[PDB]
Specification:
Layout: E1 14-16, E2 23-25, H1 43-53, H2 63-68, H3 73-87, H4 93-96, H5 115-123, H6 130-148, H7 154-171
The structure holds zinc ion (ZN) (2 copies).
């Protein structure tokens, strides 16, 4: 297995997947690494298995249909995975913890949102439909773009939103369009 965490790319106390070469810090994996199991398969492997069990799951879907899906175990896992893919980008650090807003000429958002909050909400089974998770994720980037206005720092929200959206389309097999 790899000698660095798949998510944060650092060494440390690592847990190795038994079905692929990836390794993870306990709380870098989502869900947190469940240490009782042996064999243990990571989320990448679990997602691949869902895919292989139901090959037609990879045919194109409409975003509107995907968002209305109830958060049954398969969809819960897909949202956990999509969240993990965002954390895998180093620029997620800007969006991970609770923000605060005090900049001349701007007012903070009415509903602040951050990745660790989404992570807790998933862990606590607070989303009933994929829509709730996707709305909170999109809110993170929208809040950022609105607050930073014309500061070049606004670009960080565009960049991380693009990671989110590319991964959403992949994981939920959104129908390709131009
Ligand atoms: Zn890590
Ligand atoms: Zn694996």
């Amino acid at each position: 297995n790899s000698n660095i965490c798949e998510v944060c790319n650092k060494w440390g106390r690592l847990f190795c997947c038994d079905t692929c070469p990836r390794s993870f810090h306990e709380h870098c994996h989502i869900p947190s690494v469940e240490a009782n199991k042996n064999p243990w398969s990571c989320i990448f492997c679990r997602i691949k298995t869902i895919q292989e069990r139901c090959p037609e799951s990879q045919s194109g879907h409409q975003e509107s249909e995907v968002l209305m899906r109830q958060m049954l175990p398969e969809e819960q896992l897909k949202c956990e995975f999509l969240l993990l893919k965002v954390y895998c980008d180093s620029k997620s650090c800007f969006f991970a913890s609770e923000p605060y807003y005090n900049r001349e000429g701007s007012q903070g958002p009415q509903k602040p949102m951050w990745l660790n909050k989404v992570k807790t909400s998933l862990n606590e089974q607070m989303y009933t439909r994929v829509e709730g998770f996707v709305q909170d994720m999109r809110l993170i980037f929208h809040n950022h773009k609105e607050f930073y206005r014309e500061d070049k720092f606004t670009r960080l929200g565009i960049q991380v939103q693009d990671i989110f959206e590319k991964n959403f389309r992949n994981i939920f097999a959104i129908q390709e369009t131009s």
